[PDB]
Amino acid sequence: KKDTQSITLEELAKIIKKCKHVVALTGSGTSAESNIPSFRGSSNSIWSKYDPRIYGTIWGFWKYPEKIWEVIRDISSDYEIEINNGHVALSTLESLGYLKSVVTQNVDGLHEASGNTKVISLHGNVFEAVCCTCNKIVKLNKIMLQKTSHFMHQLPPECPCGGIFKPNIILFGEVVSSDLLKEAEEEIAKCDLLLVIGTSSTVSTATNLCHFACKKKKKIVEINISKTYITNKMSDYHVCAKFSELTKVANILKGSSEKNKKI
């Protein structure tokens, strides 16, 4: 419980200029302008064909294991999914020596695709699959998630051993890997600014990490299109902005990096 202040992007550029070890905590809002809706209750979207009480939960996987595959398949097949300007900005911010890692709840792989080098995926990742009898791992790529791939032909996909593949993502009701959390915790432990970008409503995961960042008396900035659970509880500043307006921050920091010519 505490008093959050509104700041501009220009002003965030200045906060980041002083900093040696910035961390970004990212939620679905950073994939929205890549064409995947965060609302999730929108009817202008995919989440609509499918009951989130079934595909979203581990009870739902064991009863209807085809359903989370259908959802991943239709999102991959039916939408143009590309790195946006926000992802490019974060990649620059790493390049310039500011951003040390990204802790994320998205499962879509975009931060890596943009060139980030230390992405901690707390909810896992849609490009691997595990057999939930023998634990054989299978690596996948975008092209294998298409509706026409052999791997999608019969759902849920089947291991040679006779078991069934499960995506390697953490569903509601499951437990986030303690190792991955300790990783995220230590990256926060050493940081001097946490950027919390595109997150809600929340989920226990991001929240617990912000609590941890307060415990460690760390400086927190939200970049969001709106107030969130942690505004006025845990964030020190808040920037009202879309993930991709972040290239303005990257611009200000790159051109100041051109204090580079002699004299």
Binding site: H123, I170, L171, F172, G173, E174, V175, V176, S178, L181, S200, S201, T202, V203, S204, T205, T207, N208, Y229
Partner: peptide, 7 residues
């Protein structure tokens, strides 16, 4: 227990 849960 760090269960993924709805906030």
């Amino acid at each position: 227990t760090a269960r993924k849960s709805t906030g």
